[PDB]
Structure 1
């Protein structure tokens, strides 16, 4: 059932999640094809929490490089509401699908990275962390416009409560996890997102994930296999003993040079990659510095890289109520 009939017809499948499905459909009013995400999350608490945080963020954000919500279709009452349909701009593909078969020119890598960071500056300026940046969450159209999507794992930044023990369970996509997630971090600081963007840049350069860990700790071992052993200064940040002693137990490895991994890459792109893929999250480049890096000089313009107008400062039955309230503005 794809019940968007008042004005949306001719549905064609796009993809799915544990609690929803994305389709493409014709908008009988605006005479344009749109994307519609059928979301059926109400039978699972986790699905409800992710749906609510995403709707709340996406309705507040307004940025060219972030997917917006154009319409929300749902029943007029909580009792009758089984599914929620989110209508958004249609994007022809995503960076995951594109990198499966297409080599990117250096100009495409530069422009796509610029747009990722431009959108990320806005996100971070609202004190929000995306926490699941990866190629499939970067939507693209035929004119190379890029929009970040999927804010289901997003959180408000909380650096004071970022500390955790070694091997703490984590939900976001393994291959794009910063090394500190496995060591001592809950992923509540902006540096978590910069690491993922660095992983995406490496993937745009080679068409393959840079750190394809097969399981939790294997992820850290792929990272260290390229970065080499953390320095004494970076080990100064790792004060939890189990994490520290795990790193000290590893054999010494020197750094794999970026120019050996990416021999066809622009040297300025590799200098920016190095700064994004910095082991110490405190030394890792921040989004505004990355925009100002020489690799992005042809696009950089801080006056045209807007920030958010203000920061973004439960059982499944109650979460369903809040989803109903949050979607009320779209009822006629």
Structure 2
């Protein structure tokens, strides 16, 4: 057939042609990303004389209305004066072109998933991990701004991008999967490896779910492997319990999805209902991180800024980000005051 006068494919995406001239302004170079939303292209702005990333949304009502929500969250974000907003990807402008909504961003570099691939999944250093952590904590402090109160809701290595390949600066991308605070509309949220216990349990949730994901992300950036690599939801909770033990009963008594993972015994205590896992809380983060044995797999033995003390600081901060209780889970402001970041 012919879709959108031949500009679209049979899947509502714009057929990207390299070297195409848009509105006597944008020079399309090449595609750098893809997803259900549509496509992301690298291109040169002839007016501002700089490279830009252009997120071309699918020519369809559903994907259009989601991108419009993202536009309004990004435009609501750049109303604020603070310098913390530049840990979020900056939307420069947006427009309709051949029936696709196009969001124009600053051009960023590789994502943190690409970075882990570059290490052959052995992780980067604790020194670089700390700079990613301090920057993400500030990013989350900014999202916690009362007038924003934005839950990114899908934080993962893929959605954190380096500004530049020769620097440690990072920005968060993709606020099309946001679940902004308030009335609970969504329950199946967050990508599984980084999905919080309150989400797994079917419980109310808030901005604390992004801090959980960050805890997970940060350990992964130093080990090189995902911390809780569940193939399904049951396996995900089981991998969480391996490291952190059985979740507190006060939470499980309130959890609608309690019985998907756990069973309440005659004595009133909760247990794993069986379905190959280490016993509750015996896969220690102290040992996953290699606190006293020279880091993950001993690969950081003798590296500067990888002393036992440095590792205990990191461990502690991470354990505070993986508190089972979303109420006492460490908040952005206090995370930034942790001795892991203290000069």
Could you state the TM-score of these two structures normalised by the residue count of structure 2?
0.76
Among candidates 132, 138, 148, match of residue 118 of structure 1:
138
Kindly state the Cα deviation for residue 122 of structure 1 after the two structures are TM-superposed.
0.5
Q: Which moved more, 1:250-259 or 1:141-150?
A: 250-259
How far apart, in 1, do the equivalents of 2:75 and 2:237 lie? 36
Taking a change above 3 Å as real, the CA distance of residues 7 and 242 of structure 1, as seen in their structure-2 partners, is: closer
Aligned residue in 2 for 1:192: 209
1:228-247 matches, within 5 Å, as 228-230=245-247, 234-240=248-254, 243-244=257-258, 246-247=261-262
CA drift at 1:242: 5.5
Helix, strand or coil for the counterpart of 2:94? strand
Query: Is 1:51–1:152's contact at 8 Å kept on the other side of the alignment?
Result: yes
Which residue matches 2:339? Answer: 294
SS of structure 2 residue aligned to 1:295:
coil
Is 1:156 the equivalent of 2:192?
no
- Considering only aligned residues, what root-mean-square deviation do their CA atoms show, in Å? 2.2
1:50 correspondence with 2:70 = no
Q: How far does the alpha carbon of each residue in 1:127-146 deviate from its partner, in whole angstroms, 9 at most, with x for none?
A: 11111111111110222211
Q: Please state if 1:181 is matched with 2:195.
A: no
Match of 1:309 in 2: none
How many residue pairs align between the two structures? Answer: 281
State how far apart, in whole Å, the 2-side matches of 1:242 and 1:171 are.
16
Q: What is the match of residue 98 of structure 1?
A: 115
Asked if structure 2 preserves the Cα contact closer than 8 Å seen for 1:134 and 1:196, the reply is: yes
Select which of 142, 146, 154 maps to 1:132.
154
1:66 aligns with 2:88: yes
Tell me which of 277, 280, 287 is aligned to 2:322: 277
- Give unpaired runs (5+ residues) of structure 2: 1-14, 79-84, 263-269, 274-278, 296-305
Question: C-alpha distance in 1, partners of 2:255/2:203?
Answer: 14
Tell me how far 1:240 sits from its aligned partner. 3.7
Question: Higher Cα Rg: structure 1 or 2?
Answer: 2
Q: CA deviation at 1:6?
A: 2.1
Against the structure 1 CA distance between its residues 249 and 49, is the aligned structure 2 distance closer, same or farther, given a 3 Å change threshold?
A: farther
Question: Can you list the C-alpha shifts for 1:238-276, whole angstroms capped at 9, x where unaligned?
Answer: 334764454323176234221210111622111111110
Report the alpha carbon displacement of residue 50 of structure 1 after superposing the two structures with TM: 2.5
Q: Deviations over 1:144-199 (max 9, x none)?
A: 211111111213312xx55x9xxx9503211110112121325x411111100101
Distance 1:274 1:32, change over 3 A: same
| Cα distance in structure 1, aligned partners of 2:149 and 2:255 | 31
Once the two structures are TM-superposed, the CA of residue 73 in structure 1 deviates from its matched residue by 2.5
Match of 1:31 among 49, 53, 64: 49
Structure 1, unpaired ranges of 5+:
76-80, 299-332
Shift of 1:282: 2.0
Deviation at 1:55, TM superposition (A): 0.7
Query: Are the aligned partners of 2:112 and 2:160 in contact in 1 as well (CA < 8 Å)?
Result: yes
Partner of residue 219, structure 1 = 236
What SS does structure 1 have at the residue aligned with 2:91? Answer: coil
Change in CA separation of 1:175 and 1:4 when aligned onto 2, cut-off 3 Å: farther
1:102-133 alpha-carbon deviations (Å, 9 max, x no partner): 34222211111111111111111121111111
Note closer, same or farther for the CA distance 1:241–1:148 as it changes in structure 2 (3 Å cut). Answer: closer
TM-score by length of 1: 0.78
